[PDB]
Design a protein around this ligand. Sequence first.
Ligand SMILES: Cc1c(O)c(C)c2c(c1O)C(=O)C[C@@H](c1ccc(O)cc1)O2
Length: 202
Amino acid sequence: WLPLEANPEVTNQFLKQLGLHPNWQFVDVYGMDPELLSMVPRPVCAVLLLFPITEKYEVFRTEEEEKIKSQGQDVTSSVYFMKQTISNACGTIGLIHAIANNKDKMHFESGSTLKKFLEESVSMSPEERARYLENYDAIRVLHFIALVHVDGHLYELDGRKPFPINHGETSDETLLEDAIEVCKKFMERDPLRFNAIALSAA
Ligand SMILES: Cc1c(O)c(C)c2c(c1O)C(=O)C[C@@H](c1ccc(O)cc1)O2
């Protein structure tokens, strides 16, 4: 599985292995301050956020799950969501969430293994996607989540949760800034360090 660190060079090597043309490359997001965001090449189509699992995460996510089940949320049918059943798989799952939800922006090489995996898993349930990932030997190389734009909304994709989380309106053009605002919200949940990479045009 992808190592549990925010490392663009390793993640881009993985993208190449998986058969993606390198006109999208991960970059570091050096921090949330606007002059740091300006160093991220645009467009951006995904942000991966790395953070440690804490007791606060477990308590908050339980509250959030109850809230969403009670109020409902909009998760459009186009969102690709894969459950996590193996801890150390969260980096690889993050990468899959980033590519699956941006498939039409991507250029896949002929025998691309990730292209194959995506075509075969587009109609699977999140649970089936987890099982297939476990089976799929060609995908072989403290928590990661993905932030993407789908159909006008900003989705958080965390395979430890039961579903995507809708964080409000966004667009392809404003995804980086809107994702960073969601990261600021996340960090308010715990009285840490910011560690993120962005999938950027190259
Ligand atoms: C339920 C829930 C989450 O879903 C997420 C993403 C969280 C938290 C949480 O409770 C936190 O409490 C800490 C947090 C975090 C994010 C960025 C960072 O640099 C350091 C910490 O992220």
